[PDB]
Amino acid sequence: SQVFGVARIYASFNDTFVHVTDLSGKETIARVTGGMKVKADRDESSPYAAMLAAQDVAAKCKEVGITAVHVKIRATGGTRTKTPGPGGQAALRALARSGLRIGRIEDVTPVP
Amino acid sequence: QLLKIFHLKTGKVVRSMKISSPSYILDADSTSTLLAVGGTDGSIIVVDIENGYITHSFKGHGGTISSLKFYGQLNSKIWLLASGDTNGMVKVWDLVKRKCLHTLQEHTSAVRGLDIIEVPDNDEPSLNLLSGGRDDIINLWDFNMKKKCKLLKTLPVNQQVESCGFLKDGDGKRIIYTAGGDAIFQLIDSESGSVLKRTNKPIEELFIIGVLPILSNSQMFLVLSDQTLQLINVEEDLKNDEDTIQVTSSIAGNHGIIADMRYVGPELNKLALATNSPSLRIIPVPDLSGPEASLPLDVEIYEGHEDLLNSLDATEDGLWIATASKDNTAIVWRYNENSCKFDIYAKYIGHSAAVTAVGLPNIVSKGYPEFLLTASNDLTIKKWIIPKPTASMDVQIIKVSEYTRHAHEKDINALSVSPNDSIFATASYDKTCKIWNLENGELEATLANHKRGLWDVSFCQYDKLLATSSGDKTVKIWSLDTFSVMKTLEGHTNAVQRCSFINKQKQLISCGADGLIKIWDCSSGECLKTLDGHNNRLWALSTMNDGDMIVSADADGVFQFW
Amino acid sequence: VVDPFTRKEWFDIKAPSTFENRNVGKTLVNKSTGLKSASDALKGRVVEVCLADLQGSEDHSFRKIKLRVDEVQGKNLLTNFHGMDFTTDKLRSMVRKWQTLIEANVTVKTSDDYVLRIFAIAFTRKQANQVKRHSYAQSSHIRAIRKVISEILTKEVQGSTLAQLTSKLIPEVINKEIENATKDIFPLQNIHVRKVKLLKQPKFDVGALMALHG
RNA sequence: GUACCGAUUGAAUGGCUUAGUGAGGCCUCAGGAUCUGCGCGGAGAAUUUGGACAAACUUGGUCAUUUAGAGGAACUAAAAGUCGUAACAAGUCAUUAAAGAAAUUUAAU
RNA sequence: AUUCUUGGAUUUAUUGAAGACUAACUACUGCGAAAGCAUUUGCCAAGGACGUUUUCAUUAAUCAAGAACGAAUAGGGAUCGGGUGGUGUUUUUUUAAUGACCCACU
């Protein structure tokens, strides 16, 4: 039906990283992050900044051809907080509104 | 999802088309000049007129579209004539309803320009159908209103295609422009499958091209590229008068970012700017219109480099234009586009780091403007001085081994010549500015009281002062004796990149990361005026002799005269 | 300004035999020039997809399958089985208080000389009409449990190359063989395989590769 | 900054020139890394005595001008810098047909 | 604020290297005289309870000096290990059986 990819949302603290890849995971596209979309060095995980960057990330992916995508949520992991970040829920809600598809998602927290 | 309809040059919306769910990507206009249908990624076609009437749903295939063209009896996209697809397929339809007449499947590569230009007869007694936009080959298709089709020839003579052209009369005996994504456009021959001549100006992928309203072998032709346009002669091959592919003109525009600027014309005519592009664009000053049409020389951009340009400079009359880039070389260009090699006087090799600043000595008529004083990030500075022929004509090596002046540990960011040839001071990123003599290359003076590196230094033309800029929000002015610090200006709300005097030795004009230009005076040391019509970082500056027009540099391509 | 997405080849993935539908998905490679041709450049890309998303059987939503590229032919490329892994949600669902976690590992060669190390997970259940709240092991039965798994896993490997072993991993026939033999010691619960990974592929060897293709 | 007096004739160039220095090819007595051919020649590198022709290079002095110019006397610039002193000024609605699945187009009243 | 960054930082996929530790299970449970003790497997001895119709025959106990190692009254319920019994079950479409379980006794 569609052409697929993985979105791999890395919701850390004081930043949010979103970058969609190919099916293999070596080929990248639209790497744009949440900290880019405001300049105060404090709201870098604020959800309106997360909703801002997720729109522009879904913008270029809609302009290349990718329409369906898996997400892989990911915290900082290891000896860190192991907790999904602030700009993870609204950002997943932001790109799902953009006109893409969401299905069969899971967790890639390094939990050792 | 914006496909909006306008009228006469007011530009008001007549009707808004956002109905279809996929994003509209392509659109073309009509020979009826009233109807418009857009190409999209859902293969969705909607024929609409402007009063408005947005007719019958045509829905018979998916895929995506990246090329479209019309016809007077088949007035739709390449979904009706053929099929704009992501796998490549020709589909036969009609102006009558959604029945499918014939089908044609030959491609294995994606191609969207299957009928990117018409065959105007659709009977082809000696005519052809040309096609290619993604499959990187050129195919020659027949047309049959009732039977299957035939391939006339295939052309693997290309390596990449984006758009195909076709002669207006349709015989193909004359010139046929084919624009490919391989930074190459060609003149081909349809009945023989051979090229006339191939032309290689650009270093970037060609964009898609439409049509000219001209007939056969034309009078002019326009080539599309990145923020530049060029007009080409119409033979390119022994056709009417000339051959061995050439370029008629290359009209320059403006780039978003600018590093430096310097007046070229001896009566302050020409400005040359150095950008992220590896070219020399000379529009700005005499052109109070848009793109260039009124510079009194052959308008043509220069290229002799492989990377971006760092700093550029010229002398008074403007015959020698020395430029600096990241290709470790120094190249000087001529005013009126003449030389012995191409347009280059000489290219100077010997830099072991990037060439980040360039400078000329003072004018006399010759000699000093024939010379070159360039700078590199190898913590040295290099003077190329060969007086016995006319210098800047030949490759010169005079300072490569140990004649170079090396006392730096952080890089020099600028360099300035005094009105006399004796002393010159260069500023450096290690919070100092050094005076060296030009006759010997010996350390004359060391001037330093700063808190950040020094990006620009320049002299007064009465050689009584010194003007330098540092990132501690201050502009500092020194004496001519270097026994006493003269003046220290503060008031700039951020760092200052570049400072300069006026030619009447009246005012100090500064440029920095504030967002507005400031003109302090060098006489009372106060604020004569500030000027605020910017919101980006200011990086370059240039001063005319008369003092009314002052040109500035921004981060978006805006040149404000005052 | 380059816009590489008008230059990248659009390309697809073909799957091996002992599966459901051999259509998988898409990638993006490069433009095939000379000096960086696209075929010889990568040759080793890794596809990691849940097998339930390809088999269709929805009672397999864990146990993702790792793939590895071998050959390329012109809007087709063929891949090979590299690894098998559980999701983190599946095993951390299992680990309950007041029971015993028994693991096993074994290094064992296949028929064709793929050397692969699998793991093992074993958990203790309560019987019917238990009174006590834990039902642990004895710390010598765990020796009697690890040993029975260790001799069974060396029997099933080195036979009828890895696709048939892949054809046993999918309906998890291995777990019943663990189940019946080791029940006489102590009964058990959930036991699965939890991993298989390879490190000693012998050679290129196109000859046996095309025997699975239609 | 400009015009002038004046020591250094310093550096550049021009006139004259003491002094030292000297490329290059020509011939001939000797020589052989090397060549297709019914006893060996066309061709050919180094080295070599003598003889004719020979451009020209380096530096010192005399004189002029520029530059550098100690020192000596002006003009202009800087309204400039400090201090003292003086007076003025200044707050197309509805019902309803036709095409169109939907909008929309057109007619009717 | 410090730092890194177009010779590409951060993120992504593939490897190799170095050091470190056994994550949910992990308990008011076990072991050790104490200080202490958590990956598998092999080897080397040491130890306790239980069972014993084997054996020595007062061989006992407690503690200045001193040494090794370490900064330097009588019930109840649950649980660990061993043993005994079973009008007992379960694994047994395999004949047996090891083993887990149910209950009593110590």
UniProtKB/Swiss-Prot annotation, chain A:
Keyword line: Acetylation, Cytoplasm, Nucleus, Ribonucleoprotein, Ribosomal protein, Ribosome biogenesis, rRNA processing
Keyword RNA-binding in annotation: no
Keyword rRNA processing on entry: yes
Location(s), subcellular: Cytoplasm; Nucleus, Nucleolus
UniProt record, GO biological process: cytoplasmic translation; maturation of SSU-rRNA from tricistronic rRNA transcript (SSU-rRNA, 5.8S rRNA, LSU-rRNA); ribosomal small subunit assembly; translation
PTM note: N-terminally acetylated by acetyltransferase NatA.
Assigned GO CC terms: 90S preribosome; cytosol; cytosolic small ribosomal subunit; nucleolus; nucleoplasm; small-subunit processome
GO molecular function: mRNA binding; structural constituent of ribosome
Superkingdom of this protein's organism: Eukaryota
Function: Component of the ribosome, a large ribonucleoprotein complex responsible for the synthesis of proteins in the cell. The small ribosomal subunit (SSU) binds messenger RNAs (mRNAs) and translates the encoded message by selecting cognate aminoacyl-transfer RNA (tRNA) molecules. The large subunit (LSU) contains the ribosomal catalytic site termed the peptidyl transferase center (PTC), which catalyzes the formation of peptide bonds, thereby polymerizing the amino acids delivered by tRNAs into a polypeptide chain.
Misc. comment: Present with 29600 molecules/cell in log phase SD medium.
Family that this chain belongs to: Belongs to the universal ribosomal protein uS11 family.
Record protein name field: Small ribosomal subunit protein uS11A
Native organism: Saccharomyces cerevisiae (strain ATCC 204508 / S288c) (Baker's yeast)
High-level lineage: Eukaryota, Fungi, Dikarya, Ascomycota, Saccharomycotina
Residues of the full protein shown: 11 to 122 of 137
Swiss-Prot record, chain B:
Location(s) in or outside the cell: Nucleus, Nucleolus
Disulfide bond positions: none
Molecular function GO labels: U3 snoRNA binding
Cellular component terms (Gene Ontology): 90S preribosome; nucleolus; nucleoplasm; Pwp2p-containing subcomplex of 90S preribosome; small-subunit processome
Start and stop residues of the WD repeats: 20-57, 60-105, 109-151, 156-198, 304-343, 350-394, 407-446, 449-490, 491-532, 534-562
Job of this protein: Involved in nucleolar processing of pre-18S ribosomal RNA.
Protein name: U3 small nucleolar RNA-associated protein 13
Organism classification: Eukaryota, Fungi, Dikarya, Ascomycota, Saccharomycotina
Range of the intact protein held here: 83 to 644 of 817
UniProtKB/Swiss-Prot annotation, chain C:
PTM annotation, UniProt: N-terminally acetylated by acetyltransferase NatA.
GO biological process, one term: cytoplasmic translation
Annotated organism of origin: Saccharomyces cerevisiae (strain ATCC 204508 / S288c) (Baker's yeast)
Similarity comment: family membership: Belongs to the eukaryotic ribosomal protein eS1 family.
This protein's name: Small ribosomal subunit protein eS1A
Cellular compartments per GO CC: 90S preribosome; cytosol; cytosolic small ribosomal subunit
Keyword annotations: Acetylation, Cytoplasm, Isopeptide bond, Phosphoprotein, Ribonucleoprotein, Ribosomal protein, Ubl conjugation
Principal localisation: cytoplasm
Subcellular location: Cytoplasm
Note: Present with 92400 molecules/cell in log phase SD medium.
The UniProt record lists the keyword Metal-binding: no
Subunit structure: Component of the small ribosomal subunit (SSU). Mature yeast ribosomes consist of a small (40S) and a large (60S) subunit. The 40S small subunit contains 1 molecule of ribosomal RNA (18S rRNA) and 33 different proteins (encoded by 57 genes). The large 60S subunit contains 3 rRNA molecules (25S, 5.8S and 5S rRNA) and 46 different proteins (encoded by 81 genes). eS1 interacts directly with uS11 and eS26, which form part of the mRNA exit tunnel.
Coverage span on the entire protein: 20 to 233 of 255
GO molecular function, one term: structural constituent of ribosome
Its job: Component of the ribosome, a large ribonucleoprotein complex responsible for the synthesis of proteins in the cell. The small ribosomal subunit (SSU) binds messenger RNAs (mRNAs) and translates the encoded message by selecting cognate aminoacyl-transfer RNA (tRNA) molecules. The large subunit (LSU) contains the ribosomal catalytic site termed the peptidyl transferase center (PTC), which catalyzes the formation of peptide bonds, thereby polymerizing the amino acids delivered by tRNAs into a polypeptide chain.
